[PDB]
Design a protein around this nucleic acid. Sequence first.
DNA 1: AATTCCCCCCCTTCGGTGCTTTGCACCGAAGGGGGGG
Lengths: 395, 539
Amino acid sequence: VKLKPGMDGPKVKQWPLTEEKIKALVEICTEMEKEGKISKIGPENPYNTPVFAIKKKDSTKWRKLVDFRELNKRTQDFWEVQLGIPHPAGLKKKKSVTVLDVGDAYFSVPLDEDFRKYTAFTIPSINNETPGIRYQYNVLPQGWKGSPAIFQSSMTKILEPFKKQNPDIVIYQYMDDLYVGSDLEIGQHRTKIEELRQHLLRWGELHPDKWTVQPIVLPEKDSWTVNDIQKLVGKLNWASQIYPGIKVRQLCKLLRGTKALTEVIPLTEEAELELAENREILKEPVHGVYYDPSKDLIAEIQKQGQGQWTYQIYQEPFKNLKTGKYARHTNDVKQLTEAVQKITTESIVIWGKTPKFKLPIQKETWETWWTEYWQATWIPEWEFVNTPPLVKLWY
Amino acid sequence: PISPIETVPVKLKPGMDGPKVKQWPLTEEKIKALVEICTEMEKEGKISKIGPENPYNTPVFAIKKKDSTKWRKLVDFRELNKRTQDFWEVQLGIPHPAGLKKKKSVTVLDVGDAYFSVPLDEDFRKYTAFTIPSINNETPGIRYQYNVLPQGWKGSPAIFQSSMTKILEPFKKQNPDIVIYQYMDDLYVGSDLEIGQHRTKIEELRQHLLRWGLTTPDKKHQKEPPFLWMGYELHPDKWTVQPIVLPEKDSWTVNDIQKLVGKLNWASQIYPGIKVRQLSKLLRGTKALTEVIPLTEEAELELAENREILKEPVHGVYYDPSKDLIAEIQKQGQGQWTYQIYQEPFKNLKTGKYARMRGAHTNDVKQLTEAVQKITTESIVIWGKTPKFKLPIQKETWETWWTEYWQATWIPEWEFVNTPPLVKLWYQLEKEPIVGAETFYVDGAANRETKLGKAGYVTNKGRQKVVPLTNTTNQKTELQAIYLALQDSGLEVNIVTNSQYALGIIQAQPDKSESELVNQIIEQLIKKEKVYLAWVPAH
DNA sequence: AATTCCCCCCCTTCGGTGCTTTGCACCGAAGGGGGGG
Ligand SMILES: Nc1ncnc2c1ncn2[C@H]1C[C@H](O)[C@@H](COP(=O)(O)OP(=O)(O)OP(=O)(O)O)O1
Ligand SMILES: [Mg+2]
Ligand SMILES: [Mg+2]
């Protein structure tokens, strides 16, 4: 193991935690130090990463999650056997890509001795009664991007004992979660996977067919007002960037009169032709939206109200790779947190890498509550946007 | 004596040598005090004499402890600090008495000579060499080096805190019914087991500490209330801060105002209603720290109200885990908020204020959400649970804001309280054009190279008005155009503009702004009953 | 003259960043102060 050339280790501070989280986290680490996975260290180790408890849905138990985002970016590119061995076409297609927990497999392989300094974290105290208790990992940690790749040799060897007797099923691994897709009925797809859990006991459901959306259809009206035509040219000039060739020349020459916003102006033959034709250009995706692996993914999110959201995954501005919507009205951070989780899961199944979120939320609001409704194991890298968007161009 | 705890290994930054700084000329009384301290330090093995084998040096000096008649020996390890390896500090905050539970018996202890009881790494001892100057000024000088943790070294606070935690670990593990708050060497110990059995358990702690090198003298060991702990005055049933004294001077300088603001911020934690907004703005253009600054009769007003609040005696109460945390918020105007956290009515656990102004444009609802966020994270630190809020905003007002704002906003379980100064949105932009009202097609643009431009409207009725203006940018021209439209309008108006900079400001619904131009727009948007704003591409 | 070190807080200031409509809004780090040891 080695760090990225000309870099350093994580130096992120630890945010305050709830009493229930702290009480559970201490008990987890008390039983973790008795096994040798973590060991107490001192202040001479200058590195630190945050930590929190992430109790999952239908679990009734707490799980330790460590924010390793900063370590992952500074860790020299870690190869599964070359990078990540699967690029599953058919995981994005089949019926039932199930996500199951690897979880405790990593807590068998010890980490390289010289690299253990970077995986340091501090457990806070309520009303700062004692200084924070520092630990470092001895075994492979959960959340590090190099952790799955070390276990790959011990992971690719438990595939053949099952994947060879179930060939067409494509199993994909990202961090501590295993994605496996099968085009079987719920009666079958559940029974076979149940044995996979039993085949992973002693050996120590997303549907990517309803994925497309990508619509920008214009509203249909018989009586068109000057304001309504104003709302179309504005919508069809930005759309001329996403879809080059959108024609509103004659849809603006009827707006050259400076009358009121409530006047009912009829459309000419050219305007009706241009409006009708421009729908066809909106029925075909832009030609040449290439996906290259050497760039990074960006996923915007926009709030549309009534518990409805919208997102756009793209590598280049105005060159969208997947645009979709999310549906449900009493908790806003809870809805946004769940939306982020669904987008990340979609991005893993399709392109294999987590995107860069541009959250439509105030920065300080996020950390105060995102750890409460979070239920995943990985953490996407996100940034915040302090700018109100235009009128609804995706609703 | 010196504790037998294992030393923490420490290194220098790669490619860096030890310091070679020279001693300053010290005064007579500080040299005499230093020689006295260094003599007894050498007798106990805390420092060792050296000679010509050590090329390093670092200035030393002394200050006076709180309890005087005693000197604190400090070393200006400023060059060594730049070359020492980086540490990670384990002190994440300060304990608060509001988070203390009610204990029948309480005892406070202080470790004597805290740093000088922890050994220093043997390989690092050479860099800590110093030189007590010649008694008077004629002899060569005695060169020493530190065998214990030096005072003034960047690694000492972290090393001692970790060492103290390891020393206390065996005692706390075998005595889990006793609460022990540790802040450096300060030890607050309280529990049940009435004073007859509490003292017996305390002597066991002192014996445990003494076996581990640290000594707790009887002079610093408090046994009866009130207990002076971390700047507070803990009593059996209540807690108050130690007395706060504000300057009574008549000629205020920049430093004096800064000192006064800091003390009032410190006092604004159990004392309710403290405001420092008018005092703080006096420092918004100052340069030197010793220039006399007049009081603007508004800072005099605040300093009079703050002096009245601090005159009466106030106290807090202790946390009760079997009850509910409640936090009320009040708006004080001019972007000032106060809050009090309590479990029973009229018995505050803690008080505070929020006055930060984030962004160039904001309103009351955005600020109140920011105030709630600050209280929430502060409550998690002290009590580990978020409190139940009692906000001065109607549920309908909050419901309309969060279902129309483009961002995601939330407030935890809260209840409306009818405190007169209520939080309310002042205007509201309509979602559809107004039928029966004029429409303004208003926008102007300036020049990027000459710094002047024009801004006016054209109406559907044929009327228009233009006004040239200079020393304004392109964005500033657009705002003056929208303001001008609201000027030459009626009670209902439809406004159409061709740029989005003004839209983002106006749709955010501000009621105050750090820019003058947006401010009169707010005064105009409130007078109208219906206003609709539409954006069109610049063509 | 002062000469130190870690932690939390608040308030003000300046440079970097992003989108750019190359001005303007956000944000973090550094100065002052308070408190603790
Ligand atoms: N001004 C300071 N500069 C550096 N370190 C300090 C300073 N004040 C306190 N400390 C650190 C070093 C001290 O050993 C430790 C404990 O504080 P304190 O009890 O006041 O000192 P002490 O334990 O050396 O003296 P005492 O024997 O009187 O208790 O805090
Ligand atoms: Mg003391
Ligand atoms: Mg002491």
